[PDB]
Amino acid sequence: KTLKFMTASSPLSPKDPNEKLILQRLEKETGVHIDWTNYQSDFAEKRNLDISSGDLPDAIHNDGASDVDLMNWAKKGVIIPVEDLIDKYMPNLKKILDEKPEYKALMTAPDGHIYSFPWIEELGDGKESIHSVNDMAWINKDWLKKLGLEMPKTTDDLIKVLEAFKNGDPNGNGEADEIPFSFISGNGNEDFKFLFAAFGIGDNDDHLVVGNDGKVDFTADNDNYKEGVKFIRQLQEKGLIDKEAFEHDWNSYIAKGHDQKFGVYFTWDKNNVTGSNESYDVLPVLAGPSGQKHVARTNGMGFARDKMVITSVNKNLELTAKWIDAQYAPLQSVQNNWGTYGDDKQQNIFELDQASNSLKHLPLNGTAPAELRQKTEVGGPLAILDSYYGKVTTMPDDAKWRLDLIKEYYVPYMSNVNNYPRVFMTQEDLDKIAHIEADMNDYIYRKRAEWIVNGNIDTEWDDYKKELEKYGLSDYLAIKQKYYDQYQANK
């Protein structure tokens, strides 16, 4: 009858998730009422507080936990193994894992157990994966045209173009309101790290790529990365960087984007920032000063190990497992991921075709894709397989488009045969890595920021590398190299 789930949702979505049409239909379909503890900001901290305080729900929905957390909770008995529950009570999920046993391998821990229910979304594979590049660079072609400038081909062209943006008044309003270059610094889709590949090798949110000699390379200690920092520093020194880039947030970023104040900026999809217009387009991959022309691959993929865990206080394992398996029904997975049909007081992502019992995406008509999706999606455990497109649902227009942009612009320069595989380390190695990352992760971005605002990377670089080593960088690399080699060896 009733289950208590903790969940994570967008602050744009309703405070009570049961107000969402998907979940209203679901309750009428399953006969299960969910009482939600719905965290719309700082989910992970508030979740951890719940776990540390012993105030556990029946399950944690849309969880997104790290492997070290996943394993610590399992060893402590906070969550339970679920492989028997899958085999007994979950025919939708069992069909997917049995059809595609590699996903089943991705879910299994070193101890042979499965502890969580994944998100699977098949959009491209290998270099052509939609996740291959997250922080795409976009440029205002309209300003290029007004200033009579060609699309820049080199990093030196980019500097000249940004100077024209800063001083040439391309909007025509007689004010220096143009922001030549902007980003949200850190991890994620709005960072500038995409341009570091123009100096060779590049960078990603893991700071980790895989060389064609099969060696894992920590990127944030490469000379090429030092050179990428000096280039951004050059833009800062020339007054080309958004004066707010190191303090502003998403809301401010898109407000300037909507007003079309950006010359060059970074995001996943321009339609979320500068909108549905032809004024902005992909910045083509640039050659560096020595002719480097490269795109570093992320280690992202259409798979997330944990979008649901079941706690040890859960009162009705069979009911819970069956509820979760309804989320892996194809029509349900598609909707939970992307939105739904037939709302009367809200725009709809889908229309339902009753004749074929299938979903068809509707045109967004200017609405930001991320905005409507986060209002109406549900998140959580689900699977979208390649065989579903054209049968269960259409492929989203924005997904089709981005896949093609990655093919056209980036794949020709993704010269690393491999990226880092999604491995599931032992608790012992997870713990060691977690201790190291507790020092390293913030430190890297802090130093990066300080070097762009000041300009002392030349005198601080070697000390920085020694700090990383003290934090345990070469043990870090050894562990990652170890799992890479194991992954290759058993392929």
Ligand X SMILES: OC[C@H]1O[C@@](CO)(OC[C@@]2(O[C@H]3O[C@H](CO)[C@@H](O)[C@H](O)[C@H]3O)O[C@H](CO)[C@@H](O)[C@@H]2O)[C@@H](O)[C@@H]1O
428 is in an annotated binding site: no
Least distance in angstroms from the C-beta of 169 to Ca ion: 4
Dihedral sign for Cα 244, 247, 250, 255, please. Answer: negative
Give the binding range for a copy of itself (CB under 8 A) out of 25-33, 40-48, 127-135, 188-196.
40-48
Cβ nearer to Ca ion, comparing 65 with 229: 229
Interface size with ligand X, residues (CB under 6 A):
16
Contact stretch for ligand X (CB under 6 A) within 201-209, 236-244, 370-378, 477-485? 370-378
Amino acid code (one letter) for 270 = K
399 counts as binding ligand X under rule CB under 6 A: yes
CA distance 251 to 58: 34
Torsion of CA 370, 371, 376, 380, to 10 degrees: 40
User: Shortest approach of a copy of itself to residue 296 CB, angstroms?
Assistant: 25
Q: In the range 188-217, which residues lie near Ca ion by CB under 5 A? A: 217
Task: Find which of ligand X, Ca ion, a copy of itself, none residue 434 binds, CB within 5 to 8 Å per kind.
Answer: a copy of itself
Which strands make up the sheet holding 2-8, listed edge to edge? 33-39, 2-8, 59-61, 308-310
Count of residues of this chain found to bind Ca ion when the rule CB under 5 A is applied: 9
Both structure tokens of 145: 């045209």
User: Scanning residues 224 to 263, which ones bind a copy of itself (CB under 8 A)?
Assistant: 243-244, 246-249, 252
Compute the distance between CA of residue 369 and CA of residue 275 in angstroms, rounded to an integer: 10
Contacts with Ca ion in 141-180 (CB under 5 A)? 169, 171, 173, 175, 177
The distance in angstroms from the start CA to the end CA of the chain is 45
Residue 449 and residue 185 in contact, taking contact as beta carbons nearer than 8 Å? yes
Q: Are strands 59-61 and 2-8 parallel, antiparallel or unpaired?
A: parallel
Q: Does 76 sit near a copy of itself (CB under 8 A)? A: yes
Residue 42 contact partner, candidates ligand X, Ca ion, a copy of itself, none, CB within 5 to 8 A by sort of partner: a copy of itself
Q: Are 298 and 132 in contact (CB under 8 A)?
A: yes
- Residue span 239-278 as binding mask against ligand X, x where in contact by CB under 6 A, dash where not: -----------------------------xx--x------
d(CA 392, CA 90): 20
In the list 205, 206, 371, 439, the residue contacting a copy of itself (rule: CB under 8 A) is 439
Amino acid at 364: L
Half-sphere exposure of 272 (CA within 13 A, CB side): 20
Closest distance to ligand X from the beta carbon of 402 (Å): 4
Q: What is the DSSP string of 5-67?
A: EEEE--TTS-SSGGGSHHHHHHHHHH--EEEEEEE-SSHHHHHHHHHHTT---SEEES----H
Least CB distance from residue 469 to Ca ion, whole Å?
A: 12
The nearest distance, CB 146 to Ca ion, in angstroms, is 10
The option from a copy of itself, ligand X, Ca ion, none interacting with 222 (CB < 5 to 8 A, set by class) reads Ca ion
Give the residue with the Cβ less far from ligand X, 94 or 100: 100
Q: Is 69 annotated as a binding residue?
A: no
Helix-, strand-, coil-residue percentages of the chain, each rounded to 5:
45, 15, 40
Q: Closest by alpha carbon to 127, among 300, 297, 304?
A: 297
Q: What is the largest CA-CA distance in the chain?
A: 70
Of positions 93, 209, 370, 392, contacts ligand X by CB under 6 A: 370
CA separation for the pair 449, 172 (Å, rounded): 33
178 binds ligand X (CB under 6 A): no
Nearer to a copy of itself, 368 or 436 (CB): 436
Q: Which C-beta is closer to ligand X: that of 50 or that of 269?
A: 269
Output the smallest distance, CB 399 to ligand X, in A: 3
By CB under 8 A, is residue 459 in contact with a copy of itself?
no
DSSP string, 367-417: --HHHHHHHH---SSEEE-GGGBTTTBPPPHHHHHHHHHIIIIIGGG---S
Would the annotation count 218 as a binding residue? Answer: yes
373 touches ligand X by CB under 6 A:
yes
Coil, strand, or helix at residue 282? strand
Q: Could you say whether residue 402 binds ligand X (CB under 6 A)?
A: yes
Q: Give the residue among 95, 92, 124 at the shortest CA–CA distance from 401.
A: 124
Which CB, 359 or 452, lies closer to a copy of itself? 452
Residue 453 contacts a copy of itself per CB under 8 A: yes
Residue 288: both structure tokens together:
């560096």
Pick out residues in 90-129 that bind ligand X (CB under 6 A).
121, 123
- Asked if 176 touches a copy of itself (CB under 8 A), the answer is no
Binding site for Ca ion (CB under 5 A): 169, 171, 173, 175, 177, 217-218, 221-222
Binding site for ligand X (CB under 6 A): 121, 123, 130, 189, 268-269, 272, 369-370, 373-374, 377, 396, 398-399, 402
Binding site for a copy of itself (CB under 8 A): 41-42, 45-46, 49, 52-55, 68-69, 71-73, 75-76, 243-244, 246-249, 252, 427, 431, 434-435, 438-439, 446, 449-450, 453-454, 471
